[PDB]
A paper describes a structure:
Among the three subtypes (α, β/δ, and γ), [name]γ is the most widely studied as a therapeutically attractive target because of its key role in the regulation of energy balance and fat cell differentiation in adipose tissue. [name]γ is a ligand-activated transcription factor which forms a heterodimer with the retinoid X receptor (RXR) and binds to specific promoter response elements (PPREs) on the DNA, acting as a gene expression regulator. Ser245 phosphorylation by CDK5 results in the dysregulation of a subset of [name]γ target genes that are known to be associated with tissue insulin sensitization, whereas its inhibition maintains the transcription of several of these genes (and the correlated insulin sensitization) unchanged.
The crystal structures of [name]γ-LBD in complex with 1 and 3 were determined at 2.13 Å and 2.20 Å, respectively, each comprising two [name]γ-LBD monomers in the asymmetric unit. Conversely, while occupying the same hydrophobic region of 1, compound 3 was observed only in molecule B of [name]γ-LBD. In this way, the weak density became visible, and the ligand was clearly modeled inside the electron density. The ligand interacted with Ser342 through a hydrogen bond between the carbonyl oxygen of the lactone moiety and the NH of the serine backbone. Conversely, the activity of compounds 2 and 3 could be ascribed mainly to a direct CDK5 inhibition rather than [name]γ stabilization, although all three compounds bind [name]γ with good affinity.
Numbering used by the authors:
A (entry chain B): 207 to 238, 245 to 258, 278 to 453, 468 to 473
B (entry chain A): 203 to 259, 277 to 476
Write the structure that this text describes.
């Protein structure tokens, strides 16, 4: 069985690379030369306008995530409504996962890494804008201390999408069966890639709690308008 | 065959199951025995309406009883937690922090053991109160137990028995991502050991059960949600029912949760 699992993991990893331009390996190299937004004069040279821009980029993400999901073995063979339902409820969770790749404790890469917007400047935004990104920063510092890389996140992202508990699925069985196989593939992946990281698998799963917590909290704070 | 590492995880499993039996007078095993007619001596009285309530013996009188059941559950969980190796060795402040946030998640975990899709065991298993009688209570008391039922039916589908739950509720208590924790690292190393012990336990007790470990852990999402929903509904109760008194042990657990 362990053969197909490695083959599943590599399959997911290649697809992840093709679907997501800005990988985690790339983002970290940059964070360790982008234009820095630390202030208002800084931003101009680069409140409502900032929050709408996160919206624009979030919409582009969903298309990337959607393309990635269709590479997940068995995903397209699912009931079409079930596919739509899985992406509908899954993309927020995936966006925050992947946003963590672009953050450190001091700020976030924007514009596919061409910029960097400081955590402090974000906080300085008047209410309720100045509070939308602080909880994601809190989650990212926790998340990134796991030091996953892109081949780990490729499987992780796939497991999130194949969640058999989205509201209103029609045929939960093949979803959980795929998720079952993805979890097996994640577990072996973490074991070979992090032999020293004890029970990394378990601590990763526990972050879905956190992730879902962020997503519900974000929702609450929340023609062109047609597009969003 | 099993090695010295496995053998230490097995002994921690045995020790926690043992303490669990000593701390919780109504186990799942007994609850299931009562709910499924393995009884001629253990069958419960069934409350499904006002006269059946009257016969065993409103929406506040029920609520005051579930809330003082909760208090003596906190005590049982508190007794069980002291038995988790390393728990009492941690900073006293963290000990209370771990209890403050963990108690509710464990209470609804264990409450599931007393539930089927149709109702819930009460008064140590002597009684059984139907899901319908509860959902029929005046607002917002009718909204009280429905999320718990919905959790339980999914959670009960995992078919965990008590030796599993003992380790799982120990993983819950020893949660290093709790608000305000002084020393997270000693907490994580205990939970890391619990997680190893749960992982082996699930694989030995449920070998035909693919990825039960992962599926069990993902249920922590559902508990956190039950807790959140419960707090909100308690917020509403305090405004509409200012003559209703909540219990101090429980006051302290909700302050800034
Ligand atoms: O212009 C912008 O870019 C920014 C940005 C927004 C979301 C974002 O999410 C990261 C991300 C989310 C989902 C899928 C991805 C796939 C590949 C790489 C990153 C992916 C990344 C950059 C961004 C922005 C604005 C406000 C707060 C945070 C970021 C812009 O104003």
């Amino acid at each position: 069985e362990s053969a197909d699992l490695r083959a599943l993991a590599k399959h997911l990893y290649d697809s992840y690379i093709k679907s997501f331009p800005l990988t985690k390996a790339k983002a970290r190299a940059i964070l360790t030369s982008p234009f820095v937004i630390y202030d208002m004069n800084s931003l101009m040279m680069g409140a409502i306008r900032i929050f709408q821009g996160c919206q624009f980029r979030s919409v582009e993400a969903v298309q990337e995530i959607t393309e990635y999901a269709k590479s997940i073995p068995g995903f397209v063979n699912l009931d079409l409504n079930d596919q739509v339902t899985l992406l509908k409820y899954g993309v927020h969770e995936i966006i925050y996962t992947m946003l963590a790749s672009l953050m450190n404790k001091d700020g976030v890469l924007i514009s596919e890494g061409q910029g960097f917007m400081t955590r402090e400047f974000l906080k300085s935004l008047r209410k309720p804008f100045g509070d939308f990104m602080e909880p994601k920063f809190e989650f990212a510092v926790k998340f990134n201390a796991l030091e996953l890389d892109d081949s780990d996140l490729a499987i992780f992202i796939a497991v999130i999408i194949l969640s058999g508990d989205r509201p209103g699925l029609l045929n939960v069985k093949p979803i959980e069966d795929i998720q079952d196989n993805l979890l097996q593939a994640l577990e072996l992946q973490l074991k070979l890639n992090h032999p020293e990281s004890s029970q990394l698998f378990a601590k990763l799963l526990q972050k879905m709690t956190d992730l879902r917590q962020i997503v519900t909290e974000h929702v609450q704070l929340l023609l062109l308008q047609e597009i969003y």
